[PDB]
């Protein structure tokens, strides 16, 4: 809640994902303030942090095509702006009691979007400006303020909102790759590649002023371990008048890091 | 409790069912406001939602033939009307601690009875009207407001009553198949077939103004997993004078989605 | 208990002795009279169903028994049926659209002499409701069907336990009530002159006996009210002369449709009298199954 | 009740012209998805059995209800009205205006009827039945009768004692339905939706119907901007795209009783 | 001027602003509304005849003229015709038997703009009465016959001298009265859908023009009241847009017949208010032919 | 409500009828006037965007429709554009650096006669914001690019539901507000005479229509305010004369730069009036979409 009371649209972003990861891997999980793309993951060969060769893969939230279009110039056709209030992560294992081996680690990372520049020798030679997600460097090493537990219990947690009053950005259209197309990875300062993938299926529409919780699921070999993954997100939307979203609209009213999955 | 105080009949619908499902399946469970038929299930090949080929199978509550007759024109021979107050589902595993693999998911679905029509070219050509259970479409995809946990702990939950004052329907006699006999599945708008089965053994007698809890028991292969299933239902009945039910009669007096099975 | 409140109560409780809704409703004082005789060796049931236009009917079964499939028997009309329900089966919607019942109150006042009467008046309750039933029929191609049916009629096939069973000269007087807790509308049906309808066999619906109507312009059932059907048995054994003057006094709250001149007789429904709810929801069941 | 429901302010905004020399009705009905209901007849006379009828949808009718006879189940389960209201605003100048606007209420409902069916083997059958459109067949005595140049504005209220969630019934194409004779039903006139991909009747609310009579005379250039909106509550299905947007007194009925039939739009 | 007396007067004189008989009479407040348009170059007469069910009719004749034999034109109904007068020509007696008129009061309130209107409203009086006429017809054997006819219709063929003739935008408002000195019954006729009836030629009765009715169940004339027929002329010349909202408000004292539920809306007629006779028999003719 | 507080309110709410920051801010009373005519058979939209220098613009689309890609249409200037924003595209920073909006308030006061007007004024809301969009372009070597784009313009392609739609003679009067809860700065952009910029195709940004500016020294967009863009539609059908006197009155709180003489007209911003926050954050949305 806040001091503003205009026409807003509330939404609950409740994700069901059964997951089954390969043994001998390092399943790494980001839950970032990315609207419509509730989940972010990659796998790296075991024991190690993400590297330069880490090509990243999202999954979308169910029903993403409906309220953000299909095309990279179509990401703001129903909403003009949004906000954030809370996100939740939840991992609950679906595994029996003798094969297991592994650990689950949870800290936060302050990742934010930024603009890095570089000159390009064209004819005539110019310079440009691309988006980049700074802060991502902190993922690559051990954050001390973290959670630490084995695999077999699980973990539940919630994020936080890094602003005194709850101000807001806009939808940033266009973004399909981070760094963008024809721009090299080492030029920006991104150590690992971020990618959305197929244009019509998903994509980054924007960003919010939140913490990003990061999960290091450690998995040794010989331990078949499956779970459900659960993402909640207290997501707001400011709609457009042409959009159908107006018959949901009403006015807005005037714990440590993590715990285990059994509360 | 409510403002009415006529001659009512209380009943507790307490069901014991040990269950043992096939590995590599998707055991799907409905607990719908269907009097005398406490339980509703089907199995689909693994990983998937119900499809068009889903032929559905009930089990009855013990002692159904006694107070609802035997024949499709005999479903209101002891009670003329009823109500609903609460239902409970309970799953408690009977499985040891190393073979298991699986997950349990619980949301609600608002399913209600409706009447779809279609013209039939007879001689002379007419039109008709059949019953259908709309709302069932929401079962076929992931509801966000849900419960999420592995198999090994279990789940207990209770339903809710979707009406401000507790009004009521009637017993709808006749129903043995949903869609009825000689009516095609795709004509109505039912994606998956609902069936009661053998007439004398069971059958749909009516419907109540309740939520319907739905359970997606996920089961990978190689994991023999058995449980008890427990249905409670706070069921009311308004009897008939010819019925024997009158020596039970007295006057009526003037939590989030689910939790795990260990409270 | 405001000024409409006891006026609602005297409409409800004893014409011989609302809620948060404030629309333009019409209140008919249904006041009916029959001087009617019975026949010896002939069990005469009576049914007071919540059916607007038909405040009354008596059913007849041979002595010491209960109705059969062949027990197929008629309505009467409280007068006002040609006026407020038209003449054809697609004409009942012309005046009114839905109805409510405040109460129907029945009383039987005998006029027989003290030297001839024999038998009993036996009164109990039957919660009769209108439902549906489906069944496939052979057609081209084969199809399903769906017609109305009355559930709760099965209860009429035996004497109710909570009853009132005295001599024929003592008379009887009874009250009904709205068994569902708010005064719910019931939209007026049409085309109903046959329950079960034409080309439909008994035993395929579940009704043990038949409500007929006969002629189109003179009788018929237009809908169903949220009221329990009062049932009265007079057995009338062999050797007795059996006549009485019967009463059927009802209060009906109609919802009309802007055609026909009636509306001025109705007024806007009075606002809530929340206290006077408690007088209706206490006294009616405090009164027994029946009285004298 | 307090559960997961959808609030959807549904608005139709359009200008409109009126046909000169003809009597033209507009029915503000509780038929969600469809914005309003209109047809025209010759001036001074009244719609008959030979009078056809038409829908005008809200924007986004196929988006929330699908396109077919097996599509209206998909997104919302049951619904209920709270407050819907219409406003006509004049756009004819001082040099051409003629005719008037007369407003009265009509409490119509949706019921069933039976009829005998003459087949072999014969049965009976039941079709849906608009009960109360007989009440539309005159001018009700509760009148807001006023010449076009001042306009009109009026609200309704729930005609039920409190409220019910009314289900979305599915498969309505015409009222009376297709393959069914009008004379066996008893409706005054046929209420069509056309091709179902364009338009359809998806259910019935706990509201009355507001009928306005505008009969523009001959040579009368009659035109207006029509504003009709509604406040509808939905119970959605969990698979729906509408489901994410969902969320969880006495003075309303004092407004409902003391309201005039309409008010001047100025 | 007792409490029913001014209530009779406000029924009589201006709903916009009895005698020694004390029976159970029913008082309908006939309140009618039409938003109706005219046509340019077309003289529209209006007739307000004392006919229960038909409070209103406008007749149409081409410009600058008067009706012919071919001027054969219809009724409308004030709503309430299917309810209180049945559907068939032998069914009008089902509800009511005779009627009385307290008053009928007409008013025309125009809604046209100030830049287009042209023409006039011309109002006068026509004492129209229902009579008989006999004439022999060739039959086997030759016979006489006897049918109804309306006398006083001859007066409609010209503008009355005592009139009220102003612009179209000014409107008009008028009152009628009972020209015979006590409130006499008039028994309700039936079978009348054609005046003159079928197989009867104009010129053989004396009517210069025809009252038709068309369909049986939707319109008709049921009787005649002891009231003068108010006649209103609108000429509507070439070049003008011509629309108005018209009023026909009447007070009718019915005599019903014990069938149909209506009776409770009526009450026993109040006793004599001999003083308040003088207020009705002075003010009505003190009001002119018409006002604004 | 201190002395600057209602002075802030009368600046905010109706010039026809702050916070914890206390810097040397300059408050221009943006007061603009246009006597402007429309054209028949031609839908004239109006856009009031939060753009300093451009208080107003009307967009034009053929009858009964919505804008296309070819709908490419201009600004005007409230006077003061050459003075406070220079003449070249790299000269807008010369006077001021950032700006705030207290309110902009629009009103349309028609001057047409009562015998000719036809059409409507239709007003709703469009939350338009300035965003970015990236896309790769073929260069040597191949590169990416990044230019501005306006999001929320998609909303203009249809009539808003919460609207105000009356006749053309009735006029309209409206208010805006700051949709984000504190008065945030917006730094002044430069080089913007083309939205989308040169060599950039529509459909590659997402804007369905084009904001142009034309000449460099006479018009341009300098930034964006945290205000919703008020949109007004006048459809202007065939046959009507369509002229009006329009109002655009705005309050702008500038942040200047120590060059140019202006500063003495501005003063230090007054200290907090925490109560008077509640008067601004209650009354503005209590006022509707639009009034007369």
Swiss-Prot record, chains A, B:
One GO term (biological process): symbiont entry into host cell via permeabilization of host membrane
UniProt binding sites for Ca(2+) 4: 137, 189
Binding site for Ca(2+) 5: 165, 167
EC number: 3.4.23.44
Residues holding Ca(2+) 1: 77
Class of this enzyme: hydrolase
Keywords on record: Aspartyl protease, Calcium, Capsid protein, Disulfide bond, Hydrolase, Metal-binding, Protease, T=3 icosahedral capsid protein, Viral penetration into host cytoplasm, Viral penetration via permeabilization of host membrane, Virion, Virus entry into host cell
Residues the entry annotates as binding Ca(2+) 2: 77, 137, 189
Molecular function via GO: aspartic-type endopeptidase activity; metal ion binding
GO CC annotations, alphabetized: T=3 icosahedral viral capsid
Top-level taxon of the source organism: Viruses
Binding sites annotated in the UniProt record for Ca(2+) 3: 77, 137
Family (UniProt): Belongs to the peptidase A6 family.
Protein name: Capsid protein alpha
Parent-record interval covered: 85 to 362 of 407
From Swiss-Prot, chains C, E, F:
Top EC class of this enzyme: hydrolase
Amino acids binding Ca(2+) 5: 182, 184
Gene Ontology biological process terms from the UniProt entry: proteolysis; symbiont entry into host cell via permeabilization of host membrane
Keywords carried by this UniProt record: Aspartyl protease, Calcium, Capsid protein, Disulfide bond, Hydrolase, Metal-binding, Protease, T=3 icosahedral capsid protein, Viral penetration into host cytoplasm, Viral penetration via permeabilization of host membrane, Virion, Virus entry into host cell
Keyword Disulfide bond on entry: yes
Disulfide linkage: 11-251
Active site, per annotation: 17
Single GO MF descriptor: metal ion binding
UniProt keyword Disulfide bond present: yes
Annotated Ca(2+) 3 binding sites: 94, 154
Enzyme nomenclature, EC number: 3.4.23.44
Binding site for Ca(2+) 2: 94, 154, 206
Chain sites annotated for binding Ca(2+) 4: 154, 206
Residue sites binding Ca(2+) 1 per the record: 94
A single cellular component GO annotation: T=3 icosahedral viral capsid
Superkingdom of this protein's organism: Viruses
UniProt family annotation: Belongs to the peptidase A6 family.
UniProt name for this protein: Capsid protein alpha
Organism in which the protein naturally occurs: Flock house virus
Full-sequence range covered: 59 to 359 of 407
């Amino acid at each position: 809640p806040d001091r503003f009371e205009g026409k807003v649209v509330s939404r609950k972003d409740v994700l069901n994902q059964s997951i089954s990861f390969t043994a001998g891997q390092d399943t790494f999980i980001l839950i970032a303030p990315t609207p419509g793309v509730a989940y972010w993951s990659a796998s790296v060969p075991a024991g190690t942090f993400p590297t330069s060769a880490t090509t990243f893969n999202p999954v979308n939230y169910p029903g993403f095509t409906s309220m953000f279009g299909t095309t990279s110039t179509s990401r703001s056709d129903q909403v003009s702006s949004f906000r954030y209030a809370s996100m939740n992560v939840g991992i609950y294992p679906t595994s029996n009691l003798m094969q297991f081996a592994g650990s689950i680690t949870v800290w936060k990372c302050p990742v934010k979007l930024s603009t890095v520049q570089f000159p390009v020798a064209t004819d005539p030679a110019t310079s440009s400006l691309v988006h980049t997600l700074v802060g991502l460097d902190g993922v690559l090493a051990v954050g001390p303020d973290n959670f630490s537990e084995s695999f077999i219990k699980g973990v539940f947690s919630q994020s936080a909102c890094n602003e005194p009053d709850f101000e807001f950005n806009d939808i940033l259209e266009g973004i399909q790759t981070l760094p963008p197309a024809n721009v090299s990875l080492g030029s920006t300062g991104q150590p690992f590649t971020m990618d959305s993938g197929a244009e019509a299926t998903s994509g980054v529409v924007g960003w919010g002023n939140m913490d990003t919780i990061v999960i290091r699921v450690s998995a040794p070999e010989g331990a078949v371990n499956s779970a459900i993954l659960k993402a909640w997100s207290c997501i707001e939307y400011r709609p457009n008048p042409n959009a159908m979203l107006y018959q949901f609209g009403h006015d807005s009213p005037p714990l440590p890091v993590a715990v285990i999955a059994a509360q």
